[PDB]
């Protein structure tokens, strides 16, 4: 967390509903609708994990 | 902290159409059905004036 690697998306297919569908999730954050609604969206910037 | 307003609803309300209802809404995949959890919420929360 003190020195993470950096990334951003490149017009890729953001099927964001996978954050609710995959079993591995153990923490979350929000400032809008659920992950399936994030799969119903797009943005001109995409700074990413 | 007494002044409640509505953060979640199943649909937008109509002109002059008042609504007191307090039903939990499920934006997340879990049918939480009367309690909160992953993206499931009690619809009224309050200002901290």
């Amino acid at each position: 967390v003190y020195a993470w690697n950096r990334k951003r998306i490149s017009n890729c297919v953001a099927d964001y509903s996978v954050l609710y569908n995959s079993a591995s999730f153990s923490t979350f954050k929000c400032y809008g609708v659920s992950p399936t609604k994030l799969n119903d969206l797009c943005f001109t910037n995409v700074y990413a994990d | 902290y007494n002044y409640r307003y509505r953060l979640f609803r199943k649909s937008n309300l109509k002109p002059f159409e008042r609504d007191i209802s307090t039903e939990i809404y499920q934006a997340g995949s879990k049918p939480c059905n009367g309690v909160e959890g992953f993206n499931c919420y009690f619809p009224l929360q309050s200002y901290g004036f």
Side-chain angles (χ1 to χ4, degrees), chain B residues 1-9 11-16 18-49:
Chain B
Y1 297 105
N2 290 280
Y3 280 97
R4 281 176 170 183
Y5 74 103
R6 186 174 285 105
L7 286 72
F8 304 94
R9 205 173 177 272
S11 64
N12 295 33
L13 46 63
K14 291 179 180 175
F16 302 121
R18 191 167 66 181
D19 185 7
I20 284 175
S21 311
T22 66
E23 309 305 316
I24 281 62
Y25 297 110
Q26 316 91 331
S29 305
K30 186 165 62 176
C32 311
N33 299 7
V35 185
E36 297 196 321
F38 175 81
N39 287 307
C40 58
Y41 303 108
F42 177 87
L44 304 188
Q45 313 292 332
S46 64
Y47 305 115
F49 291 146

Side-chain angles (χ1 to χ4, degrees), chain A residues 23 30 32 35:
Chain A
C30 293

